Design a binder for these strands. Sequence first.
RNA 1: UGGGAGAGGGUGGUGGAAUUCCCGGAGUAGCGGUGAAAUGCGCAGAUACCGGGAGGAACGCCGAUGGCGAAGGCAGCCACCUGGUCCACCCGUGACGCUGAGGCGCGAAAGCGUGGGGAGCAAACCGGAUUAGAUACCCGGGUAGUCCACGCCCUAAACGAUGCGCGCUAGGUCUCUGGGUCUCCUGGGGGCCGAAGCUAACGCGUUAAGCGCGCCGCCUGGGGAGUACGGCCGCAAGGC
Lengths: 97, 114, 155, 68
Amino acid sequence: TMNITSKQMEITPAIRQHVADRLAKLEKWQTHLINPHIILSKEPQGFVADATINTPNGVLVASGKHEDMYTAINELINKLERQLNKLQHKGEARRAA
Amino acid sequence: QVASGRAYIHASYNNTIVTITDPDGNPITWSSGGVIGYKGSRKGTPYAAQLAALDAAKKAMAYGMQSVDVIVRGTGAGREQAIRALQASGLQVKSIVDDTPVPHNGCRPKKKFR
Amino acid sequence: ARRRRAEVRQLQPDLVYGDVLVTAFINKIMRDGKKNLAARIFYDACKIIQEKTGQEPLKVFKQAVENVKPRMEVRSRRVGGANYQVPMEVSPRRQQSLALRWLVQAANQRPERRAAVRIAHELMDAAEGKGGAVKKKEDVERMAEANRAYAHYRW
Amino acid sequence: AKVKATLGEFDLRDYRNVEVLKRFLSETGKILPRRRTGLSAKEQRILAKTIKRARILGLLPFTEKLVR
RNA sequence: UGGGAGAGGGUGGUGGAAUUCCCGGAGUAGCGGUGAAAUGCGCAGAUACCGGGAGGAACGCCGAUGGCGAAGGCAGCCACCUGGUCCACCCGUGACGCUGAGGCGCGAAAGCGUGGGGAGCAAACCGGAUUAGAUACCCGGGUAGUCCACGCCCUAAACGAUGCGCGCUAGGUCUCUGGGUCUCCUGGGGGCCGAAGCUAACGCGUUAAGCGCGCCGCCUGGGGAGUACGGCCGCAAGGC
Ligand SMILES: [Mg+2]
Ligand SMILES: [Mg+2]
Ligand SMILES: [Mg+2]
Ligand SMILES: [Mg+2]
Ligand SMILES: [Mg+2]
Ligand SMILES: [Mg+2]
Ligand SMILES: [Mg+2]
Ligand SMILES: [Mg+2]
Ligand SMILES: [Mg+2]
Ligand SMILES: [Mg+2]
Ligand SMILES: [Mg+2]
Ligand SMILES: [Mg+2]
Ligand SMILES: [Mg+2]
Ligand SMILES: [Mg+2]
Ligand SMILES: [Mg+2]
Ligand SMILES: [Mg+2]
Ligand SMILES: [Mg+2]
Ligand SMILES: [Mg+2]
Ligand SMILES: [Mg+2]
Ligand SMILES: [Mg+2]
Ligand SMILES: [Mg+2]
Ligand SMILES: [Mg+2]
Ligand SMILES: [Mg+2]
Ligand SMILES: [Mg+2]
Ligand SMILES: [Mg+2]
Ligand SMILES: [Mg+2]
Ligand SMILES: [Mg+2]
Ligand SMILES: [Mg+2]
Ligand SMILES: [Mg+2]
Ligand SMILES: [Mg+2]
Ligand SMILES: [Mg+2]
Ligand SMILES: [Mg+2]
Ligand SMILES: [Mg+2]
Ligand SMILES: [Mg+2]
Ligand SMILES: [Mg+2]
Ligand SMILES: [Mg+2]
Ligand SMILES: [Mg+2]
Ligand SMILES: [Mg+2]
Ligand SMILES: [Mg+2]
Ligand SMILES: [Mg+2]
Ligand SMILES: [Mg+2]
Ligand SMILES: [Mg+2]
Ligand SMILES: [Mg+2]
Ligand SMILES: [Mg+2]
Ligand SMILES: [Mg+2]
Ligand SMILES: [Mg+2]
Ligand SMILES: [Mg+2]
Ligand SMILES: [Mg+2]
Ligand SMILES: [Mg+2]
Ligand SMILES: [Mg+2]
Ligand SMILES: [Mg+2]
Ligand SMILES: [Mg+2]
Ligand SMILES: [Mg+2]
Ligand SMILES: [Mg+2]
Ligand SMILES: [Mg+2]
Ligand SMILES: [Mg+2]
Ligand SMILES: [Mg+2]
Ligand SMILES: [Mg+2]
Ligand SMILES: [Mg+2]
């Protein structure tokens, strides 16, 4: 299933559930999300949202950063999507010749 | 029964069609990438043309055909192999001519050819 | 590897028949580096096939090998947007490896309870042209012929 | 092996001289490039033009089948 | 005055290849299509092959780094009508010149109106694929339109992103087309590399983006915006 780590931070089950609903956007692509792992962390500048997810067509590794922990998470999701969309379609590029 | 006749090779990128005629140009038999059993892009392979040319030749000889004049149309991959297979069939291949249609700049082609 | 074509290991001829091919077969039988065990199993098998059919074990073994050698195989190649099963000739080195491999594997799918016996019998069937080993070879070949049309994609 | 060499004086403008003109046609009926006819730009221009007339009179082909 | 080259323009004719369709013949189990497929077509006889016919559009090779035009642009061949342009002679006129706000004309494609025409192609549209989805790309269809006449529209990466004219400032090399005395020389075009010089650089360099003069057009931070309002033009679209 899905693991979430809050490094040197406390978070709530609510917040954990939020992340799960946010990662859920990746379900769009109808591909297997294998051991998704989210790491939440606090720098002096803001929060950091890390993630490593493996799929049948490669790994997704992304880091999101922002003063607002939710935005940091949202940017993490944005970076993950762009990667997942490349993983899922890059092979189609060279179908001809 | 016809001893001599013609062999037409219609060879495109998608398929190779071979039709053996009489000397007037009327078909006695024919074969293709479909007849020898292939579907899809496989019909455009050289081997396909080979089986096709053979099956067409075999059928033709069964009507007594011995010599043929080979008329070739198209730039398909299975072209030369069809010509090959006709020679190596047991027919005389009295001649070989390419009669591929080419316009002197007629009709606007489909989008994919521009 | 990338730089050069690697060197085929020259094996040491076996003690009982003086045969590099036998040695190779032994190693393929050999699990966990227990070659003494491996050696016995084959030689025990060599005893058995003599009892069941009085001939030269060596002759049987070698005949079984020549019967499991695939002369043609398919190797995939994704051309364009599809993976074509391209028909290829097998190098004699590889013919050997596949033959000895399938022999042991098919042997160890058999129902009789002792290895030496399975190894014995499979070598007997493969010599006569029966058994799962030869079935593998026949199949691999049929796949290749089945895709003769793609034989121009050969590298 | 340039065609212009194989002939002496001829009329570049004579559309009836099938015998000379047919030299300047490939075996497939096409008009030959300068690199085969050895003609200058100016002479090739006249050659092409009178070849086309000869075709319209019926004396030269527009195209020919290629025998192998 | 005497010549030259050219897809310069307009009008009337006319040739062959190919596509499609229709007719006749012959023949059978598929054809077509794609990356792979499917839709589609086909035993109600398709595809492939032969003969006949109809019709529209575009002109293979020649063809080129080529030619012509002010620009847009111009390509089978014949004829008629007609423009620009170059050369040699150095014969005539005697500054008759340059530019050019307004004006006028021309102005690719798409589009519009009236009428014809319609083979191929193809916006819109319908279907098949592809894809997570695919109002696309690919595939099978498909109407305007694409073509002709006349009348409109007046835009563009309408580009050399480079206004026109004149004079001046190394050469090398390829090419088109004239005139020599024909080695080569000299005109007029079209390219390339480069003297000096220019340039922020890239680059330009006797086809200047160098050095000068004349006249015109134009710019004055990005967005808002080629928008609004007014006016003028247009059938509308929409243009200035
Ligand atoms: Mg577990
Ligand atoms: Mg967890
Ligand atoms: Mg803790
Ligand atoms: Mg916590
Ligand atoms: Mg990190
Ligand atoms: Mg998003
Ligand atoms: Mg990307
Ligand atoms: Mg096909
Ligand atoms: Mg094994
Ligand atoms: Mg096996
Ligand atoms: Mg058998
Ligand atoms: Mg004359
Ligand atoms: Mg004059
Ligand atoms: Mg019919
Ligand atoms: Mg016909
Ligand atoms: Mg050309
Ligand atoms: Mg040019
Ligand atoms: Mg010019
Ligand atoms: Mg004078
Ligand atoms: Mg005077
Ligand atoms: Mg004005
Ligand atoms: Mg216009
Ligand atoms: Mg128009
Ligand atoms: Mg229109
Ligand atoms: Mg209308
Ligand atoms: Mg109209
Ligand atoms: Mg109306
Ligand atoms: Mg109409
Ligand atoms: Mg129509
Ligand atoms: Mg659709
Ligand atoms: Mg769909
Ligand atoms: Mg949907
Ligand atoms: Mg569609
Ligand atoms: Mg379409
Ligand atoms: Mg269509
Ligand atoms: Mg409409
Ligand atoms: Mg209308
Ligand atoms: Mg309309
Ligand atoms: Mg008009
Ligand atoms: Mg204007
Ligand atoms: Mg241009
Ligand atoms: Mg200009
Ligand atoms: Mg401009
Ligand atoms: Mg001006
Ligand atoms: Mg001269
Ligand atoms: Mg000259
Ligand atoms: Mg010059
Ligand atoms: Mg330069
Ligand atoms: Mg300098
Ligand atoms: Mg300056
Ligand atoms: Mg000078
Ligand atoms: Mg110069
Ligand atoms: Mg100039
Ligand atoms: Mg400048
Ligand atoms: Mg501004
Ligand atoms: Mg406006
Ligand atoms: Mg506008
Ligand atoms: Mg207004
Ligand atoms: Mg303007």
